[PDB]
Design a protein that fits this description.
Motif (Probable selectivity filter) (chain D): 296-298
Order of helices and strands of chain C: EEEHHEEEEEEHHHHHHH
Shape of chain A: globular
Largest sheet of chain C: 7 strands, mixed
Helix content of chain A: under 10%
Helix content of chain C: 40-55%
InterPro entries (chain D): CorA_cytoplasmic_dom (IPR045861), CorA_TM1_TM2 (IPR045863), Mg/Co-transport_prot_CorA (IPR004488), MgTranspt_CorA/ZnTranspt_ZntB (IPR002523)
Number of helices of chain A: 0
GO molecular function (chain D): cobalt ion binding; cobalt ion transmembrane transporter activity; identical protein binding; magnesium ion binding; magnesium ion transmembrane transporter activity
Distance between the termini of chain A: 27 Å
Chains: A mainly beta (122), B mainly beta (107), C alpha+beta (348)
Order of helices and strands of chain A: EEEEEEEEEE
Number of helices of chain C: 9
Radius of gyration of chain A: 14 Å
Largest sheet of chain A: 6 strands, antiparallel
Structural class of chain C: alpha+beta
Structural class of chain A: mainly beta
Oligomer: part of a larger assembly
Function (chain D): Mediates influx of magnesium ions. Mediates Co(2+) uptake. Has high selectivity for Co(2+). Alternates between open and closed states. Activated by low cytoplasmic Mg(2+) levels. Inactive when cytoplasmic Mg(2+) levels are high.
Shape of chain C: elongated
Distance between the termini of chain C: 74 Å
Radius of gyration of chain C: 35 Å
Number of strands of chain C: 9
Strand content of chain A: over 45%
Transmembrane segments (chain D): 277-297, 309-329
Bound molecules: magnesium ion
Number of strands of chain A: 10
Largest interface: D-E, 39 and 37 residues
């Protein structure tokens, strides 16, 4: 029943901007955290951004810090990544992910991306 | 920035052979280590979270463990579905990083 | 009073604090004199309209890993966020708090498995408001089947009267099914005492310490059951309606009896480590006696075999009646006197 | 004054005078340099390193009007952390732990903090502190520390310290989850000692962090007029973080205590095993040693010589004596 | 039990009241007459200057330090109407806390402890309280007590104390004593921590001697605290006419304090009981290492001597011993068996 | 037993004809004494086994 769909990706001229999107079906964004994972062709997964619409807290990868802005709206149950000052190194196959916190010790928690998107290429 | 170094870079084994994939953490990640499988052209799927707990629906043959900062994803016996790329992820901080990946291919 | 702030987490999120994330099921029983309706719903919307329904309803939510469902229910049913956090927080001690509208109850369940002396702990939480009982539990498999079949058979006063009897029924069933596990553990410890009196092997220390830790956990659980039943019985909060004061006093006495039982059984268990130390000390003493006697007889004999076994240019060998059997007889005599001394001292 | 600090090597004074518009850094060693900066209306930060220099911290304290009992309490290094409330100022003392690899010990550094008006004062035992993040935030114009008053700065210092407590707990967690398997599977000579040092560190951390939780609870509940009302939720958050730390410490201590008592209970069986080995080998090889020693004799006349195959026969009977001694055991399962 | 009268002591003239303690140095009398109007403090060594305070309307606090002066105690008991048996119990230090109710006064016995460092000793001092109308008589053995906070409150009109009557003074004194019991318990907890460290990190005879001293200290602590619980319970339940009805909740609070103290003492007793087994296990561990060294040496060397005896016998009947060799075989066998035994001890590690 | 005697000592419902309260006081004191003696016994019994273990250690020492 649960499906997490991302869209908005496509060909972009270098130095331009592209507004991504992610649509959630079966679960509410307000009760979870939405991440973004990109994979350049033939490379490893690289986490870029994370958002929690309940509080609006944002986490950004130091590799791509400042070139990206992430947010979500509770009206349409969607999340999206807005791209700024793009370059060649930003080319990858971006992913939308759903993560839930788990408890290991009273001082430390963990994240686990249990549901992912289908995948969009930028 | 806790970079994770994964070994071996590339490995190959036949069906039914027990294998192990080891992940190394430069800094201390308590137990926030997860394992995923990514088939070619497919979305990654959660297998092990908290370095020792199997995600629901995963076959019970998969198993992972922790030894200090040594994280090992071992497979009791490989299957045709198990020739893929496996990734090591640390979730200790808000900044979360992945491993390089181990590519498994049939002998 | 609001959600506690955690360093790793974002400011407002609520996190499950358990190990069970396999199953999700909701059971809703709207039991009444005229009739009752039972059904299982995989989604959370169906339980919402029963917020203000006059007829009593009993909602059993299995699987708390879905924090979404729990906080949706909390927002719909008026549950304060901190109560939601403590519902998710399995790592907890049993307790109850009184609010203006609802009564929140925390008390744990235990299960036991054969061949593995492991004592689990399932966090089951109860919420009492209006005429609804909300139950949150970690995994499938409960101890409340007798109450469910009693409602289905219509037998008993619980179906005819108000839902405070339903809360009492749940709590009584939980305390009652403590006893199946307690009987299993008592049988296990009795048979284990049988082997430790028979065979004091290496694994005995591990098994006895496992049982000791099990008793420590049972005490840490049972002692909070008073000051819970204490509050329910003495404090007589308004939601009780004073009809069930003896149905809380009897459970008070039951809990006091259980606490006294665990207090006694802790010393009973420590006596087992004492007995094991006794047996191992006696075995060490036996080993010492055997080694000492063997060395004591056979060392002077080595004196003889060395002193006379010396080679010297001018040794007073002085062969008298082929004195080699004479020396052998001397060794025999000293060995006999030594073993006689050992027998008299009763080392052997 | 009475002094008990361990170190004497270094001494340095640092002052931070920053406002909403501009900030300035000053590096110096004269005592009178910080005297004019006290009168500044904007919140100010004072960093004094080196407690052995009693004269300079004295002159500062009598310049600030601090009661001498507070001064001597600061001079005290081995005390439990505790918070004092006075009309002129609020007095706080904390701890600063440092952990190391390849050798497992706890090093604690006494730090004390006094907040009066718009002035922030602290005394450091050595150079270097866990407060690098707050200094970096102030220097590069980040956060909302500048907008608020000095009590928010005190908050920032405390939360930096609790962040370093979390950093310590991560190393403790690694050590405990490696010692778990070290004790369970492969005991060593020094595994026992490692467990004792681990428990010592854990109990010291518990006895240090309980006073810190009490201090933060007092700060949150008492809400003294000197600290602004708007900054109390932040202190409550730090109190919650200390609750997290305390729970972690208790769980870790329980794990280490179990690791201790299982091993300490196995020692009697260890002794039985060792002496069983010694006794069996000694009782098998002493009679044979005598048999060889006395039949290998140097008297003139030997009946052993006359017997045919005497040497193989005595070797065979020695072997069968060894065999019957071996089978004498395993009746009580000694072997 | 029937009627009560002075028990006859052999070797003593009849009716003799004797101090059964150890302190003979100090003697002092403190008077603190206080009211809402003013306080009149007084410190002296004359017993005749405190007797007029018997008929004072305002609350009075007379504190006679040093009961080795039996004459002073007898004079005060005669003037205040105290029974001779109560005086005997006052001078009988070797006792346990108690409370007695009479028509005109309330008699209470308590205990003061002072734990000492650098000498692990718990020493006790008996304190007696008599509540007579408006006066509260206090008897002590040596200079030093725990009632400085009450004195400060009287001096500075701090708190409710000066507004109320003498029974509130009795409350305050008993509460101060029970409060200092908590500091005593904290000191003993620190001692338990130090001793439980010392048991494992350096186990020796002094450690077990200190452990036994601490265990007996805990036993006498319980023997003292349980009668304290009983006397506080009697005070707030039986509530004689001398105790006013407005004072009972304070006694309830003190009673709850006593219950908490008793639970703390029980937990301390359990920990100290476990300390003995911890110490035994540690010393057995050290003996185990010594034992293993012995076993390794004996295991390596006894079979080699046995083989030497095998080939060291002058059995000249057979030419087997007369084999042309450069001694490779026997020495090689001894070396290989020795190294095999050593590596066998490397596994199942003994070292 | 101490609690059930204290109840008859202090509550004194009208079924207790009074003037008999001191007798229940006596029985309450007796229960106090029994409790003290019982816990003295348990204190001795706790250390009995430690004494036995040390005696066995003494014999193996000999
Ligand atoms: Mg020889
Ligand atoms: Mg020899
Ligand atoms: Mg022994």
């Amino acid at each position: 029943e649960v499906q997490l769909v991302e869209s908005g990706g496509g060909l972009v001229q270098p130095g331009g901007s592209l507004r991504l999107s992610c649509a959630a079906s079966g679960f509410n964004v307000s009760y979870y955290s939405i991440h973004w994972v990109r994979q350049a062709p033939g490379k490893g997964l690289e986490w870029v951004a994370s958002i929690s619409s309940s509080s609006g807290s944002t986490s950004y990868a130091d590799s791509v810090k400042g070139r990206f802005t992430i947010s979500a709206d509770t009206s349409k149950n969607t999340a999206y990544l807005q791209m700024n000052s793009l370059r060649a190194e930003d080319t990858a196959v971006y992913y939308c992910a759903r993560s839930y916190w788990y408890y290991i010790w009273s001082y430390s928690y963990g994240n686990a991306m249990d549901y992912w998107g289908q995948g969009t290429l930028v | 920035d806790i970079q994770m170094t994964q070994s071996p870079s590339s490995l190959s084994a036949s069906v039914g052979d027990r294998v192990t994939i080891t992940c190394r953490a430069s800094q201390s990640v308590s137990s926030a280590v997860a394992w995923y499988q990514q088939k070619p052209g497919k979305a990654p799927k959660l297998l092990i979270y908290s370095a020792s707990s199997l995600y629901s629906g995963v076959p019970s043959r998969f198993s992972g463990s922790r030894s200090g900062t040594d994280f090992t994803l071992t497979i009791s016996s490989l299957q045709p579905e198990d020739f893929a790329t496996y990734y090591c992820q640390q979730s200790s901080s808000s900044l979360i990083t992945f491993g390089q990946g181990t590519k498994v291919e049939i002998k | 009073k609001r959600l506690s702030a955690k360093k790793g987490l974002p400011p407002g999120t609520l996190v499950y604090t358990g190990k069970y994330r396999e199953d999700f099921e909701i059971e809703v029983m709207n039991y009444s004199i005229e009739e009752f309706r039972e059904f299982k719903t995989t989604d959370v919307e169906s339980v919402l309209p029963f917020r203000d329904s006059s007829t009593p309803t009993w909602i059993n939510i299995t699987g708390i890993h879905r924090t979404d469902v729990v906080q949706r229910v909390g927002e719909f049913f008026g549950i304060h966020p901190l109560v939601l956090e403590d519902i998710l927080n399995v790592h907890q001690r049993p307790k109850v708090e009184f609010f203006e509208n609802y009564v929140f109850i925390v008390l744990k369940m235990f299960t036991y498995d054969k061949n593995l002396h492991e004592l689990e702990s399932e966090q089951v939480s109860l919420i009492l408001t209006k005429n609804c009982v909300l139950m949150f539990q970690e995994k499938i498999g409960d101890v409340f089947d007798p109450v469910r079949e009693r409602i289905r058979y219509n037998r008993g006063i619980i179906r005819k009267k108000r839902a405070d009897y339903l809360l009492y029924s749940l709590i009584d069933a939980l305390v009652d099914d403590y006893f199946v596990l307690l009987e299993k553990i008592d049988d296990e410890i009795d048979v284990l005492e049988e082997e430790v009196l028979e065979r004091p092997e290496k694994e005995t220390v591990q098994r006895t310490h496992q049982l000791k830790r099990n008793l420590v956990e049972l005490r840490k659980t049972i002692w909070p059951l008073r000051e819970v039943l204490s509050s329910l019985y003495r404090d007589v909060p308004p939601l009780i309606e004073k009809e069930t004061v003896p149905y809380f006093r009897d459970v008070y006495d039951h809990t006091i009896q259980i606490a006294d039982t665990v207090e006694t059984f802790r010393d009973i268990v420590s006596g087992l480590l004492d007995v094991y130390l006794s047996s191992v000390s006696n075995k060490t003493n036996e080993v010492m006696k055997v080694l000492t006697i063997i060395a004591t007889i056979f060392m002077p004999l080595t004196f003889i075999a060395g002193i006379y076994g010396m080679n010297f240019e001018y040794m007073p060998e002085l062969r008298w009646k082929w004195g080699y059997p004479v020396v052998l007889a001397v060794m025999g005599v000293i060995a006999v006197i030594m073993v006689v001394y050992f027998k008299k001292k009763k080392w052997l």
